[model samples]
Each structure stands twice: as structure tokens, then as C-alpha cells.
Target: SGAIYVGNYRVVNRHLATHNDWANLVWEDSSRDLLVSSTTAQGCDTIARCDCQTGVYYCSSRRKHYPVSFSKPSLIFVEASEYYPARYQSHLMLAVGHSEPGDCGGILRCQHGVVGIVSTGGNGLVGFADVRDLLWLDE
Candidate 1:
């Protein structure tokens, strides 16, 4: 469901053209002092995790969970493509506060990524919506 626009409709519409499917996984470290996250725009299993010792970020979407290189990072936002009205499209965004905390971040690792509504196509096998690609919202 779409809602009313509060800004200039023309500007908003124009910006929409440049918009692409993207997501940002934001979370605060267990220490509650440092903020850590990943920023990915690539489609297909775009998951990210931080390496605590080096403070480096790695992204993967191959499975539900993987070994972590962090000390409890949470997911904040998720945006991706979805079957809207008839065909698949982007601009479907979902936001949440600090989600499940873990050492890894991915479609199968993070609680937010793996958790999704299931639907089925002609094949009988259930299809799940994936984050595809995501990153730190600010970046």
C-alpha cells in the first residue's frame, strides 16, 4: 500500500528513476559504543559480517548461518525487490530497530535475513525472499 507524499511530487518521482534495489545492515557492537554494519548493492545473497580483530566487513548470502567474525552485531534495515502488483520490482523497504544479535550477518546467519514470508511458484517448492545485496545504510 502506498501512502501520501509530503515532499515535492515531481522531485520524488524524478528521484525514483535513479533508485535501485539496495539494503543496509546496521548494528551496534556488543560494547554498545561502536557502530558496525555493511553496505551492499549487489543482488544475490548480499550478506555482511565484521571481523572483530581487524574491524573488516565481509558479505555472503550462500546460506542461513555462517561462522562469525564479530561479537554480536544486529540488523537494522532491509530493502530489496519483491513481486509487486504483478511483476517483480524494487523499492520495497523494511526497517526495524536492533534485530537479532549474532557474530555473523547474512540471509541464513542473521535472524532478520533468514526470516521471511514464503510463497510458491508453479514448482511446488516454496520461494523465499532474500536480501540479495545490502550494506551499511549510511554508506
Candidate 2:
């Protein structure tokens, strides 16, 4: 199922990248707010959670899908790597605003001396995306 780009006789080709995967998680809190958890570019079970308290963020494994208050509007996703093993190479189509919040951005931990300065939004959940080295969507 490939699409070929037309060219001057020489057919230009652009197949799907062999390794292109991503996952994100999001949900609503008790206060009725948006909470998002985005996975890191790391190939392993790496992720980041919004700091519900200090307005900071943290990263964790990829096995455990996070929990959330369904009936909210938000999103969560992660990225895959070329090094992903066959075991974890399952087709991925992660999204937010869904009730079943999957593994990503549940609990977080400080690793490799990386200081994450997260800011909690109106909701209690922390906004770790703004911090450096976690999930810099703006950058």
C-alpha cells in the first residue's frame, strides 16, 4: 500500500518510514480540567507526566497506561524509535479525550540530573510539557 510521487519519467518514491511510532495520554481531573502526558523520543518505556502539585513534570516507563477522569477533552501520545524491538513494535495509534487512558505520563521520576520545571494549570495536574527535556512541543 504505497503511493508513488510523479516525476519527470523518473518516479519519485516516499514510502512510510520503517520506524515511525508515537503515543500520548490525556484526561480530565476532579476539578474538570485538561491533563496531557506526552511520551519522550526515547525508544524505551519512557514518558512524562504533568505535575499535579508543583507545576513541574516527570518521565516514566511505557508499559503502564495512565489513569484519568474520562469525559474530558485532551490528548496524549508517544514516539517510536528505530531501535524498538519486535515485542514493542506493535502498530500504534494513541490519542487523548478517550476514557481509557493508556500507559504514559502517570507517575514521574527525575532521571539523569535533568531538572524539569513544570507548571500546573487551573487543574491540579502539573504541566510538564513546558519544562526542558521532557516534552517540548513548542520547541
User: Which candidate number has the best TM-score?
Assistant: 1
Q: Which ten residues in a row have the lowest lDDT in candidate 2?
A: 4-13
lDDT of 2 by residue, 1-139 (tens): 1111111111001111122211233221212112333333322322333322221122232333333322112233222322221222111112121111221223323332212221122123322221222243222
Per-candidate TM-score against the hidden true structure: 0.20, 0.17
Show where candidate 1 strays beyond 4 Å. Answer: 1-85, 89-122, 137-139
Span of 10 residues, lowest total lDDT, candidate 1: 1-10
Q: lDDT by residue for model 1 over 92-129, one digit each (tens)?
A: 21222112212122122243222211111222111222
For candidate 1, give the lDDT of residue 82.
Answer: 36
